[PDB]
Write an enzyme that holds these catalytic residues in place. Structure first.
Site, mmCIF file in Angstrom:
data_model
loop_
_atom_site.group_PDB
_atom_site.id
_atom_site.type_symbol
_atom_site.label_atom_id
_atom_site.label_comp_id
_atom_site.label_asym_id
_atom_site.label_seq_id
_atom_site.Cartn_x
_atom_site.Cartn_y
_atom_site.Cartn_z
ATOM 1 N N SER A 1 23.410 -14.476 7.807
ATOM 2 C CA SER A 1 23.704 -13.867 6.897
ATOM 3 C C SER A 1 22.393 -13.676 5.999
ATOM 4 O O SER A 1 22.199 -12.376 7.091
ATOM 5 C CB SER A 1 23.934 -14.886 5.496
ATOM 6 O OG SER A 1 24.637 -14.679 4.393
ATOM 7 N N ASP B 1 34.268 -10.887 5.516
ATOM 8 C CA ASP B 1 33.599 -11.540 5.978
ATOM 9 C C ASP B 1 33.370 -12.015 4.080
ATOM 10 O O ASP B 1 33.327 -11.012 2.759
ATOM 11 C CB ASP B 1 31.971 -11.207 5.831
ATOM 12 C CG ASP B 1 31.098 -12.346 5.788
ATOM 13 O OD1 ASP B 1 30.204 -12.705 6.530
ATOM 14 O OD2 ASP B 1 30.007 -11.569 4.750
ATOM 15 N N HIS C 1 33.123 -17.102 6.768
ATOM 16 C CA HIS C 1 31.147 -16.423 6.622
ATOM 17 C C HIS C 1 30.442 -17.605 7.614
ATOM 18 O O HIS C 1 30.291 -18.696 7.499
ATOM 19 C CB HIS C 1 30.899 -17.056 5.370
ATOM 20 C CG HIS C 1 29.329 -16.216 4.720
ATOM 21 N ND1 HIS C 1 29.189 -14.994 4.607
ATOM 22 C CD2 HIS C 1 28.680 -17.097 4.124
ATOM 23 C CE1 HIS C 1 27.826 -14.836 4.796
ATOM 24 N NE2 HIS C 1 27.591 -15.951 4.161
HETATM 25 C C1 T1W Z 1 24.142 -11.117 1.604
HETATM 26 C C2 T1W Z 1 23.352 -11.456 0.531
HETATM 27 C C3 T1W Z 1 21.714 -11.260 1.170
HETATM 28 C C4 T1W Z 1 21.520 -10.784 2.286
HETATM 29 C C5 T1W Z 1 21.630 -9.254 2.230
HETATM 30 C C6 T1W Z 1 22.400 -8.658 1.921
HETATM 31 N N1 T1W Z 1 23.315 -9.673 0.286
HETATM 32 C C7 T1W Z 1 23.399 -8.404 -0.338
HETATM 33 O O1 T1W Z 1 23.878 -9.407 -1.173
HETATM 34 N N2 T1W Z 1 24.208 -7.847 -0.596
HETATM 35 C C8 T1W Z 1 23.921 -5.996 0.423
HETATM 36 C C9 T1W Z 1 23.735 -4.879 -0.306
HETATM 37 O O2 T1W Z 1 25.347 -4.825 -0.698
HETATM 38 C C10 T1W Z 1 25.794 -5.903 -1.855
HETATM 39 C C11 T1W Z 1 24.595 -6.626 -2.442
#
Ligand code: T1W
Ligand code: NAG
Length: 340
Positions: free
Chosen positions: A145, A242, A286
């Site tokens: 993740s 996911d 996930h």
């Molecule tokens: C799963 C989390 C933590 C690691 C990076 C990706 N994550 C996000 O929450 N994001 C990415 C961009 O698009 C939506 C926001």
């Protein structure tokens, strides 16, 4: 059991200024080293980070960490649990920087928190060289993740670090699990990452930075945009549906939602078409690599531990030992081996 070691350089810290660290179990008969990056979202401003400090403090501090941790999945030393790399040297790097492993900012009179994820990785590598990493033939940087995105952001910097220190024989590779996201439209996100990068003094890989230029570094957090710029070999594991992707998409079944879910799986499949080492089953789930039952799922009849072994052989197509495995069926759990 992997045993805790706090960083000897106490200026490389978790969010609250406590020392960062790593858990280690050595295997002196092996020249393979697995360094795993934990995940767990992130925080992007003072108020959001204060909330995280109240109820997710182990992700911001080492003061309460236990002295040992059990290795599971790809971190297990038992052949039955880990057919791929059971005899390797195992390292688990706790996520205590809340910055998707991108930060390079110390706590100061102007900064309530330190965001040092990129420097934590570099310091763990440096201190491991004295404990046997100097004799390695393969360093596999893996993560789930936020840790999977962290692999994409850091694998080439580790390679550059080892070359510059005078270890040209160590082959650095990456394994990104559940860190390959789409910047798509919601059913009913990127701004939080943009604000985070400025709050953390976050850093992205150089070639990707040069493509997107100042103010647009957030683009390099998305696998399909950063992956083509990387020189180290990277294997991508990604569920087509996911659960974190759906959460950020505000999906929690009528025609509109059916079309939305089918389109999401189609777009993800498209982005992996030119990724030659990949494993992408049509499941709603996930993470996978450190789960004890990670041996169960199969794509086209091939398990993930097998696909990873075939990847090792390719880095020495192979009859009966594939490395690119992406489901084509269009709905969650159309693959009968999905987790239930
Ligand atoms: C799963 C989390 C933590 C690691 C990076 C990706 N994550 C996000 O929450 N994001 C990415 C961009 O698009 C939506 C926001
Ligand atoms: C400790 O880490 C900091 C931050 O990376 C660095 O500036 C300093 O040189 C390190 N100390 C030593 C002795 O390497």
């Amino acid at each position: 059991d992997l045993r805790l070691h706090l960083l000897l350089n106490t200026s490389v810290t978790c969010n609250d200024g406590s020392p960062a660290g790593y858990y280690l179990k050595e295997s002196r008969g092996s020249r393979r080293w697995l360094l795993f990056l934990e995940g767990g979202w992130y925080c992007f401003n003072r108020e959001n980070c204060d909330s995280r400090y109240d109820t997710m403090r182990r992700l911001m501090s080492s003061r309460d960490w236990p002295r040992t941790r059990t290795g599971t999945g790809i971190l297990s030393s038992q052949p039955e649990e880990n057919p791929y790399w059971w005899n390797a040297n195992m390292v688990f790097i706790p996520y205590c920087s809340s910055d998707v492993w991108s930060g390079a900012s110390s706590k100061s009179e102007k900064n309530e928190y330190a965001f040092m994820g990129a420097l934590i990785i570099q310091e763990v590598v440096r201190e491991l060289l004295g404990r046997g990493l100097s004799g390695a033939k393969v360093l596999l940087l893996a993560g789930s993740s936020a840790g999977g995105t962290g692999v994409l952001l850091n694998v080439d910097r580790v390679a550059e670090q080892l070359e510059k220190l005078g270890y040209p024989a160590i082959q650095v590779r990456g394994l990104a699990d559940s860190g390959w996201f789409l910047d798509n439209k919601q059913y009913r996100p990127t701004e939080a990452i943009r604000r985070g990068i400025r709050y953390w003094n976050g850093v992205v890989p150089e070639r990707c930075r040069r493509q997107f230029q100042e103010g647009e570094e957030w683009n390099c957090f998305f696998g399909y945009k950063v992956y083509p710029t990387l020189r180290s070999p990277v294997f991508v594991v990604q569920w087509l549906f996911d659960e974190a992707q759906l959460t950020v998409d505000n999906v929690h079944v009528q025609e509109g939602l059916r079309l939305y879910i089918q389109n999401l799986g189609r777009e993800l499949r498209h982005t992996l078409k030119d990724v030659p080492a990949s494993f992408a089953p049509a499941c709603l789930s996930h993470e996978i690599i450190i789960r004890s039952h990670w041996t169960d799922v199969q794509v086209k009849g091939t398990s993930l531990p097998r696909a990873l072994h075939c990847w090792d052989r390719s880095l020495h197509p192979l009859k009966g030992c594939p490395v690119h495995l992406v489901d084509s069926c269009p709905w969650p759990h159309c693959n009968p081996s999905c987790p239930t």
